[PDB]
Assembly symmetry: C3
Homo-oligomer: 124 residues x 3
């Protein structure tokens, strides 16, 4: 497997890679609303989701892929009431044909953020 | 990629495709207890899981795949107490060799349903 | 698809296989702090995580793969305060390049365990 590393997304501090290229796919770690400089982006679901989308885009690009190549996303929210806003921003980055998706609300996410999104995309 | 669309399963209730075929796999979105016409299927876990299973089956068939080709499922339930009933119905649709699986109880699911099941299957 | 079955990891109790080999990948079911004979390992996050890691390792090896072939992990914790410890033990089982990862916190896990981890790896 090949690890993907880019400064355009929050650095991977720990036992994980921003993304891994393997078997024709790109497995992207769950992105949170953290700026590449390590600053946490707070605010409503729309502002936080925008940062998550930018991180995903940045990692996918560094992997030689892109948003249009994403085939599956796994989305976690901390509040069911944030679904509408999340979907609106999500739709600003992902356009038809859309990826397959699974979304759920959980107790908490890394650093207390409102949203975390991981994905799988086609390589190349 | 290659999008999968069928009227035999509920239409997507967000910016996502029912399933996506890519790299030899079929990535199926998290299915919830909605009837093909989009109406909610209320009831206990056995009733709602049956609806989810039929939706999975329909999407998989439309993708040229099937339940026996599923290699991994990601199952989310809103109530840990629903695990027994979920497993019973699940066992009516998936038979050995069973898919690899992750079953976790979470805070909330789309439309406030009891269960959401996404999966990955072999395209052939 | 080929179901993986080994006695070196907690036996699958329910409608699922410990892992499935398909499409060049190995899909591993969620593992919790259970010993091979079925005994529950309690204690702090470090001790419980070790058992989970050993379970993943055993299943992966039984599948003809290994920890170094893991490309993606999905981790669930019952207490976000346990993340530091979970991350440290997790790091003991992986070496660069590390897998892509998604981590979330849930209210509670089966049998009150502190952690659960599922993953996907290359079949070598």
């Amino acid at each position: 497997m090949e690890a993907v590393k880019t400064d355009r997304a929050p650095a991977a501090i720990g036992p994980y890679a921003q993304a891994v290229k393997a078997g024709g796919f790109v497995f992207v770690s769950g992105q949170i609303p953290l700026a590449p400089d390590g600053s946490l982006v707070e605010g409503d679901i729309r502002v936080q989701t925008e940062r998550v989308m930018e991180n995903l885009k940045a990692v996918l690009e560094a992997a030689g892929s892109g948003l249009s190549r994403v085939v599956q996303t796994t989305c976690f929210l901390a509040d069911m009431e944030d679904f509408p806003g999340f979907n609106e921003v999500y739709a600003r980055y992902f356009t038809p044909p859309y990826p397959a998706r699974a979304t759920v609300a959980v107790k908490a996410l890394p650093r207390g953020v409102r949203v975390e999104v991981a994905c799988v995309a086609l390589a190349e």
